[PDB]
Amino acid sequence: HQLVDNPGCNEVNSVNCNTSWKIVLFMKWSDNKDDILKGGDVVRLFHA
Amino acid sequence: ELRNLQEKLESTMKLVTNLSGQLSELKDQMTEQRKQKQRIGLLGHPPH
Amino acid sequence: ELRNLQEKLESTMKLVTNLSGQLSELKDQMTEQRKQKQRIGLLGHPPH
Amino acid sequence: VYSLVSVPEGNDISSIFELDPTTLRGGDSLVPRNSYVRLRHLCTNTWVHSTNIPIDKEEEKPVMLKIGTSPLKEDKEAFAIVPVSP
């Protein structure tokens, strides 16, 4: 059932019907340290 | 105790040495990977 | 005391061994340098 | 090969940038979140540089400046990666 305010959206329920939730990795453990430039960080780019 | 401290430092250098150890079997899977690749090439014709 | 002298000589031979250790990661930057060179070649066309 | 712009969609090779340290080098060394960076373009091997000409030439005391890419390397231009916390 699509949402009414947002046209391209669908609800997430908890009914008994079956669904599969594929685990897609994005960031491995031990790559989530704060002292490393990561792949999802937000930065501002100061000239020298 | 100075022997024990020297042994702890040597244990650190030998753990670096066993990191070079798994580097040695990294070379092992490189060598057996190219060897099995040419083996499949000579004893089979799989399309890509 | 002769064990300690033999341990000092063994520390000398193991420091030569850890020079072979940084030789092992010299082979590491050789391998990853050629690997990243072919990676840039396959996933990019930079002029020379 | 000049005048960095913004493209709407970004899987192309024209938007791939690569970076090298100002300080001592490294093959893989966990870029430490605050280091100074010189930006190198991939599709044409060209280095970014700060041009002093303004974008808007019509109004006095112009706030908009240009940037460009020049194929020789210098230590004048070296952007810093300063992060913002979540």
Short mmCIF file of N, CA, C and O in Angstrom, two decimals, chain A residues 2-10:
data_model
loop_
_atom_site.label_atom_id
_atom_site.label_comp_id
_atom_site.label_asym_id
_atom_site.label_seq_id
_atom_site.Cartn_x
_atom_site.Cartn_y
_atom_site.Cartn_z
N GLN A 2 0.71 2.08 -1.02
CA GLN A 2 1.51 3.29 -1.14
C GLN A 2 1.03 4.36 -0.16
O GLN A 2 -0.15 4.43 0.19
N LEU A 3 1.97 5.18 0.28
CA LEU A 3 1.62 6.32 1.11
C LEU A 3 0.93 7.39 0.27
O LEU A 3 1.14 7.50 -0.94
N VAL A 4 0.07 8.17 0.93
CA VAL A 4 -0.76 9.12 0.21
C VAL A 4 -0.06 10.47 0.02
O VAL A 4 -0.19 11.08 -1.04
N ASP A 5 0.69 10.94 1.02
CA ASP A 5 1.39 12.21 0.87
C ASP A 5 2.61 12.07 -0.03
O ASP A 5 2.88 12.93 -0.87
N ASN A 6 3.37 10.98 0.13
CA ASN A 6 4.54 10.72 -0.68
C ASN A 6 4.18 9.69 -1.74
O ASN A 6 3.81 8.56 -1.39
N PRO A 7 4.26 10.02 -3.03
CA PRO A 7 3.74 9.12 -4.06
C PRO A 7 4.60 7.87 -4.27
O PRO A 7 4.06 6.77 -4.43
N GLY A 8 5.92 8.03 -4.28
CA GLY A 8 6.80 6.90 -4.49
C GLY A 8 7.29 6.26 -3.21
O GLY A 8 8.50 6.23 -2.96
N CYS A 9 6.38 5.74 -2.39
CA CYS A 9 6.74 5.19 -1.09
C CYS A 9 5.81 4.03 -0.76
O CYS A 9 4.71 3.94 -1.30
N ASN A 10 6.28 3.15 0.12
CA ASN A 10 5.50 2.01 0.58
C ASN A 10 5.71 1.80 2.07
O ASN A 10 6.81 2.01 2.59
#
